[PDB]
Design a protein around this ligand. Structure first.
Ligand SMILES: *[C@@H]1O[C@H](CO)[C@@H](O)[C@H](O)[C@H]1NC(C)=O
Ligand SMILES: *[C@@H]1O[C@H](CO)[C@@H](O)[C@H](O)[C@H]1NC(C)=O
Ligand SMILES: *[C@@H]1O[C@H](CO)[C@@H](O)[C@H](O)[C@H]1NC(C)=O
Ligand SMILES: *[C@@H]1O[C@H](CO)[C@@H](O)[C@H](O)[C@H]1NC(C)=O
Ligand SMILES: *[C@@H]1O[C@H](CO)[C@H](O)[C@H](O)[C@H]1NC(C)=O
Ligand SMILES: [Ca+2]
Ligand SMILES: [Ca+2]
Ligand SMILES: [Ca+2]
Ligand SMILES: [Cl-]
Lengths: 431, 431, 432
C-alpha cells in the first residue's frame, strides 16, 4: 500500500489518494534574537545669519534669530556640533564683543560669554549680507547640527534564526504540522513522510507601531537593502545608543561665491551660507548638509519596497511518501520534571542553560513554556536551549506543569551585559 | 526492486544497478541579489612644493608645478581634501601675497584668490628647499588627496541566496536534475529518490570585465576576505556611492626632520615633505599616505587567491534510493494564466508580488520567464516570488505563454527606492 | 520488515526494537575559517597639568608630572593622539618658552623642542590651577590617548562554516556517525536511514588562554545583543598587524572646569581634559573624560560568560530511525594511493584549495587529504576544489596506504595578507 504524490503549497491545494491531504496553511518557527530599536542616521541642521554679536550662544540666547523648534530638537540630538563665527565684530564699546575677543577657539569671548558651542573668528569672510549700519557693521553666523532620532523612523527589529517553515496539513481531517525537524505524520493506513524543501535561512522582522513586515536575510548591508535602519542607529533598550556612530558633524562657513559650492558636502558635513538680506540689519542662511550614507531615508517608502507582508518560503511542492510502516510507540513519562533551573537570557541568541531531574516511567519530552527543548531519560539532565519566552518558566514532560527557578535576563539587559556603559573618567594626581 | 547505491559527485561517476545513473554535471540554482559595483577604497595623493605664492589654487592654476593627470584624476575623486600652505610669503609688493593674508583658514588670501582648497599659514616650517632668491625667498606647498575609483579595480557583484546545488543526472538516458527541493527521478518502472547533502549557503559572484569568480559566504568582512571590494566602496548603479564612506583625508605638512616621520601615517592620513631642489627656485615633494584598511588592494592578485573558478559544493556521495512506487498523476492545466500582474523588483532580495487567475482543468504549474513560482488551483492566486529575470514577463502553466502586466524595477532602482539621494538643503529666513 | 522509531538526543538515549540503537554522543564537523586575533577598541587616556613649560614633550621628558606606566603603554597604542597646550608661557627668559613660540601648530616651539605631539596655544584658558608664583605664572597641559590592545581582552577566533552536527550512534554495537551529508548506517542484515534536523548554520569559536573554547551561534550579528563582540571590533589576522575598519585618532580637547560643554558627555573617541586646582604651590591635577568606542567599555570575562556557551548548539531532535531490509550495492574501490597529487591555495581560510592528481585503476578512489574526505573519483586524472582544515604536509590516500602530496599551501594569516600591499604608500613629486 506504498504510494507517492506531490502536494502544492498554495491555499486550496489538496491530494485525494490514498489518504486525502489538504494544505491548511503555511507558518514558521524560529529562535528570536531581539535587537531592540533601529533608526536611520538623520543629520539635521539649523542656524542663523546674525547682524549682531550675541552674548549668549544657546537656543534661548539666539531666540531672536534661530528657528525655535528646530534649535531645541537639534540641540537634544546625538553627536551635537555647533559653531559661532564672528564675521564683523564691534569696532568700539560693547562687552567682550571686539575682534580681539575672537582668537582661534574663542577662549577670550568664552571667559565673559560661556557657551557649549565652538567660537571662531571669520574676519575675511564676506559681511555683505549685513547692511544698513551707518558707522559700525556687525555680523555673526551660527550653525547647529546633530543626528536627530525621529519616532516615526524608529523600528523595533527581531532577527529570526534557525527558521523552520511550518507546512500545516490536514491528513484525513487530522492536523499535522511538518517541518525539516519533524516531517512525519501518523495515519492508520501507515506513516506519512513529507519531503520538504530547505528552510529559507535567517529572517528580519521589522515591527511598526502594531504591524510586522518581513525581510529575507541578515540583512545584507552591502546590497539593495543598504539603507535598512538595521545597518544604521542601534539602541538595544530603545534609549541608549551602542556600536558604530558617525563623528560629530563638520560645520563650515562657506561664502556665496566660494568655489567649494561647485562640489557637494560629504557625509556629516554641514555648509552654511549667509544670504544678503532684503531688510536692513538682517540676513538669511542657506544650509547644505551631506546626509549619512549619501541619502535621506523615507521610512514608509523604504519598508513598502524592501519588505513583504509575510515571511518568504520556497514554492514547493511537498513530496508525500505514504508508507505501510507503523511507528513503535515508546512509553512516555507524564509526571512534571523536578528541581528545574533556567539560567541565561531569552530572545538573545545565546542558548540558556536548562537543568533538572526527569522523573521515572520513560523519557521526559521537556517543554519550557510550551517550547520543545528535547527528550531526556529518567534522572539528571542538562541542556543548552534557545528560549523565545520570558520568565516565569512552566516546565512539563507532557502532562502537568511545574514552576522552574529562573535567573534569566531580557534581550536589552543581555546587550548591556559584559560592558560598562558611558563616559570613562580618570584623575591624574599632583606629585 | 528496492535497491540502494552511492553515486560519487566527480566527472565520470556512474552506477549500473538496478538502473544506470550517470553524474552528467554539477550546477546551481539561486535567488540573485545584484549589489551593483564594488571597488576598494583607494587613497590617492598628489601635490607640489612651489617656490612662489600662486594666486590660483586649482589643477589649471598650479599647472606649472603639480603633475597634470594625477591632479585632474584626484580632483574628481571621492571625499576630496586639498590644502595650500604658505611657508614663506612675499616680504613686499605682490597681490594678496604678504604673510598677513595667511591668517588661520586663509580667508584674507581667499577674498582676492578664491579656491575650493583649505589655505593655511606654515611660517615656522623649513623653507630650505627653496633657494636661489637674492632678496625675497618665497615658498608654498600644495597637497591634494581623495578616494579614486580605479576601473581595473571595480568589480560587478551578485550575491546568491537560497542556493541549491543542482546534481545533473542521467537515469538510463533520461535527464533528471536533483536538488534539496526536487530530489525525485522517474526510473523505467519505478521512482528514484536521491539523498543529497545540504546546500552550501550563500555565494558571492565577482564579475570581472566577462568572467565570473566565486566566493563562499556573505562575505565575512571579519576574516581572511576582509579586503574584499564588497567590504569597501558600494555603488548600486555603478555611478553613485551609498552607505559607509571614509572621512576626508587629513593632510599634514611634515618637515624632513620632524619626529612624526619615525611613525607611520594612520588610515586616511597624508603627510607631505618638501625635498630640497637640485635647481634654483624649484623643489620636490615626498608623500606618505596611510591607506584605508592599512593595505592597498591588488585586484587581480586578491581575486586569484580569494576566489574559485566555479561555485563550491559538498564532496558527496549521493544516496540513490531505488523504489518500485510510481507517483500519482494529477491533472495539469495547460492553458495560460489570465490577468497576471507582477509588482516589485527583480534580482533585489525582496520577493515580488505575482497575482492572477489560474485556468480550469487542474493545477497551474506557474512559470514567470521559465522560473518556477509554484503550482496553483484554478481561480485567483497570489504569491511572493523572488525573481531573477527582468520585465517583460511571459507567464505559463506549462503550455502556451501570455504577456503579464508589470510594474517591476531593477536592482539599482531598488537600492535608491525609499531614499532621497544627495545634499539636503534648508533655508533659514530673516525675521 | 520495515520499522520506525524516534531516538532522543540526550546522552544515554536508546531504542532496542528492531535493532539496538544507542546515542553515544553529539559532535560537529565544519570548514574552519581562522580570523586570527580579535580585541575590543579600548580608548585609554592619560596626561598632566604642569605648572611649567617643559622642553621635552615625551613620556621621559614629562616623567616629573605624567604617570610613567600609563604614558608608556598609551604611547605604544593604536591611532595615538597627543597634544601639549601652553596655558601661560614664560614672560621673560627661558629657551623657546615665551608666548610667541606658541603659534597655532607650535612650529616655533617645535624648532627648538621637537616632539611627535601636537603643540597648541591655550592662552585664554583658566590658569587658576597653577598658583604660588611671585612674578611669572607658568602653566601647560598634556593629554595623550590611543587604542590600547589589552592581552587579557585579546581572543583567537575561528569561524565555523558548512557546519554539520554529528550524531554519534552505536547501531547493534557498530559505530555510525550520522550527519545531513551521511545519514545511513548498516544494520546486521539491512540499512538504517536516520532522519536528522537541519544543521545549525555558522558557529563562532572564541579561544582564550590553559586553552579553552567558547561558542557563539551565528556570523556573529554585530547589529544585535552580541554587538560588543571583539569580532565586531579590532581585527589582527597574524596577531600583530591591524587590518580593515579602524577608529579615527582620538580628539583631544582642553576643557575648563566651568565650560558648559561639561554638562554633556564626550562622544566616541573624544577625550576632554580639565585642570584641577592644586592643594600645593606650583602643582595641579588633571581630570579626564573619555568617550569609549561603541559607547561602552568591554569587560572580556563577563562578556564571554554571558554571550557564549561551553559547547556548540544543536537542535533538540528527536532523530527519525528508518529501518529497511535493503542492502547497499558493493562497488569495487581502489586501495592503492593516488599519484602526482598537488595541493594549491590555503587552509582554514574559507577559499577552497585546488586538489589535483591521478586516481589508480581498479575502482573509485575515496580520496582523503590528511584524513579529510574530499570525495570519490574514477580512475585517472581528477581535479577538485576542497576546503581544507589541516596544514601542509598533505598525506593522500584512497583508503589504503598513504603518499606525500606536493603542496603550495599558505596559512590563514598569510591568506589575509595575500592580494594586498601592507603599510604606508609612498610617492615622490619631482621638480619641473
Ligand atoms: C499545528 O499547529 C496549529 C497552530 O499552531 C495547532 O493548533 C495544532 O494543534 C498543531 N497540530 C499538531 C498536531 O501539533
Ligand atoms: C536539466 O537541466 C538541463 C540544463 O539546464 C536541461 O537542459 C534539462 O532539460 C533539465 N532536465 C529536466 C528534466 O528538467
Ligand atoms: C613600547 O615599545 C617599545 C618599542 O617596541 C618597547 O621597547 C617598549 O618596551 C614598549 N613599552 C611598553 C610599556 O609596552
Ligand atoms: C565516528 O567518530 C569517532 C570519533 O571521531 C571515530 O572514532 C569513529 O571511528 C567514527 N566512526 C565511523 C564509522 O566513521
Ligand atoms: C529649512 O530649515 C529651516 C530651519 O531649520 C526652516 O525650517 C526651513 O523652513 C526649512 N525648509 C523647509 C521648507 O523645510
Ligand atoms: Ca564692525
Ligand atoms: Ca619671503
Ligand atoms: Ca607667564
Ligand atoms: Cl525513505
Amino acid at each position: 500500500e506504498e504510494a507517492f504524490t506531490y502536494l502544492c503549497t498554495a491555499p486550496g491545494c489538496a491530494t485525494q489518494t490514498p489518504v486525502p491531504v489538504r494544505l491548511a496553511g503555511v507558518r514558521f518557527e524560529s529562535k528570536i534574537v531581539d535587537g531592540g530599536c533601529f533608526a536611520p542616521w538623520d543629520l539635521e541642521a539649523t542656524g542663523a545669519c546674525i547682524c549682531e554679536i550675541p552674548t549668549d550662544v544657546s537656543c534661548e540666547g539666539l531666540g531672536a534669530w534661530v528657528p525655535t523648534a528646530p534649535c531645541a530638537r537639534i540641540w537634544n540630538g546625538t553627536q551635537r556640533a555647533c559653531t559661532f563665527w564672528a564675521v564683523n565684530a564691534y569696532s568700539s564699546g560693547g562687552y567682550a564683543q571686539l575682534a580681539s575677543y575672537f582668537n582661534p577657539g574663542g577662549s577670550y569671548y568664552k571667559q565673559y560669554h560661556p557657551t557649549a558651542c565652538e567660537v571662531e573668528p571669520a574676519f575675511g569672510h564676506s559681511d555683505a549680507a549685513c547692511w544698513g549700519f551707518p558707522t559700525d557693521t556687525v555680523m555673526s553666523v551660527f550653525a547647529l547640527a546633530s543626528y536627530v532620532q525621529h519616532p516615526h523612523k524608529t523600528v523595533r527589529v527581531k532577527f529570526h534564526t534557525e527558521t523552520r517553515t511550518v507546512w500545516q496539513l490536514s491528513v484525513a481531517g487530522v492536523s499535522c504540522n511538518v517541518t525539516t525537524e519533524h516531517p512525519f505524520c501518523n495515519t492508520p493506513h501507515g506513516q506519512l513522510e513529507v519531503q520538504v524543501p530547505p528552510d529559507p535561512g535567517d529572517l528580519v522582522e521589522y515591527i511598526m507601531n502594531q504591524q510586522s513586515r518581513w525581510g529575507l536575510g541578515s540583512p545584507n548591508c552591502h546590497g539593495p537593502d543598504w539603507a535598512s535602519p538595521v545597518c544604521q542607529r542601534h539602541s538595544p533598550d530603545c534609549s541608549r545608543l551602542v556600536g558604530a556612530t558617525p563623528e560629530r558633524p563638520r560645520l563650515r562657513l562657506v561664502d556665496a561665491d566660494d568655489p567649494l559650492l561647485r562640489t557637494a558636502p560629504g557625509p556629516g558635513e554641514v555648509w552654511v551660507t549667509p544670504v544678503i538680506g532684503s531688510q536692513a540689519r538682517k540676513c538669511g542662511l542657506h544650509i547644505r548638509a551631506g546626509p549619512y550614507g549619501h541619502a535621506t531615508v523615507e521610512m514608509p517608502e523604504w519598508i513598502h519596497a524592501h519588505t513583504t507582508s509575510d515571511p518568504w518560503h520556497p514554492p514547493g511542492p511537498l513530496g508525500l511518501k505514504f508508507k505501510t510502516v507503523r511507528p513503535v510507540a515508546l512509553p512516555r513519562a507524564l509526571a512534571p520534571p523536578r528541581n528545574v533551573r533556567v539560567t541565561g537570557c531569552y530572545q538573545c541568541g545565546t542558548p540558556a542553560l536548562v537543568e533538572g531531574l526527569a522523573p521515572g516511567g520513560g523519557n521526559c519530552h521537556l517543554t519550557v513554556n510550551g517550547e520543545d527543548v528535547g527528550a531526556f531519560p529518567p534522572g539528571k539532565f542538562v541542556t543548552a536551549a534557545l528560549l523565545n519566552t520570558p520568565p516565569p518558566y512552566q516546565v512539563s514532560c507532557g502532562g502537568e506543569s511545574d514552576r522552574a527557578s529562573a535567573r534569566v535576563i531580557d534581550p536589552a539587559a543581555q546587550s548591556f551585559t559584559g560592558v560598562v556603559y558611558g563616559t570613562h573618567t580618570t584623575a591624574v594626581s599632583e606629585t
